[model samples]
Target: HMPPNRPGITFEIGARLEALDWLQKWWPSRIEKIDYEEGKMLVHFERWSHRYDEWIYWDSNRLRPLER
Candidate 1:
């Protein structure tokens, strides 16, 4: 089953990785889990550890989709 939210970025977690981080540049990020209670999702940065995975707002600036 897919997650309940339809955001700018794909939330399926398997289809593709979402974009995260700063500037006009972006880094590959994977959704490890989602927490609707806080309306945020946990994303694992490719170059970072899973233990340090971060929670981001639903519509944050850097929480952008990689698709053009």
Candidate 2:
């Protein structure tokens, strides 16, 4: 089910794989771990001391980065 004000988000295997590839290409050095819950996705970096945590939201066909 889609959450209020959110649509086209998915946690399907194909979507996750696509997201991973995008992340690797754009933020290659920042990736430490990746996970998802409900429909939101999280990306954790290897060096977190000074870096801010961020999130990625699904936008129809791909994951879009959102900073937090």
Candidate 3:
């Protein structure tokens, strides 16, 4: 089933937690690489011989979470 939509942070709870865990697991040393391409935000990180990348659509609400 498709997941319900939330106002902020498009990832699902579990996925968010997993992402956070991965980030924390390599805290202080992981490369936080970001870029913008074709109006989308691209996030990349390297940890434990692996690379994680995500592309998020640029949205005005992201700048104003309270409004969302």
Candidate 4:
């Protein structure tokens, strides 16, 4: 079950965001905010997007393979 007005069915969106938050809390680094855009969520770190050369895709708890 998902909250109303949710962007997509990507549970990883929340998972990864939570992971980043935990990492930041356990370390000494600033954590950027997560924003909803279009049909997905944008993850930012230190004012920069962490993803490079790829777009984040999600299906439930499974993330799109990053294999290259």
Q: Which has the greatest TM-score?
A: 1
Every model's TM-score: 0.63, 0.26, 0.25, 0.20
lDDT of 2 by residue, 1-68 (tens): 34224333334432323223333443321323334345444543323332543555433233433222
Greater-TM-score candidate between 1 and 3: 1
- lDDT against the true structure, per candidate, is 0.63, 0.36, 0.32, 0.29
Whichever of 1 and 4 has more lDDT, that candidate is: 1
Winner on lDDT between 2 and 3 is 2
Please tell me which predicted candidate would have the highest lDDT against the true structure: 1
Q: Which pairs clash inside model 2?
A: none
In TM-score terms, candidate 1 sits at: 0.63
How would you encode candidate 3's per-residue C-alpha lDDT over 1-68 as one tens digit per residue? 23234454443212221122234442212213223334443433323334455544334232212121
Task: State model 4's lDDT.
Answer: 0.29
For each of the candidates, give the backbone clash count. 0, 0, 0, 0
Candidate 1 per-residue C-alpha lDDT over 1-68 given as tens digits, one digit per residue, 9 for 90 to 100: 33445555666444345556433346777877776666677777766667657777656666666565
CA lDDT for candidate 2: 0.36
**Model 1 lDDT, full chain set:** 0.63
Q: Candidate 4 on 1-68: residue-level lDDT in tens?
A: 33223242233433333212223321111223323342233433322345511232222222222222
Question: How good is model 4 by TM-score?
Answer: 0.20
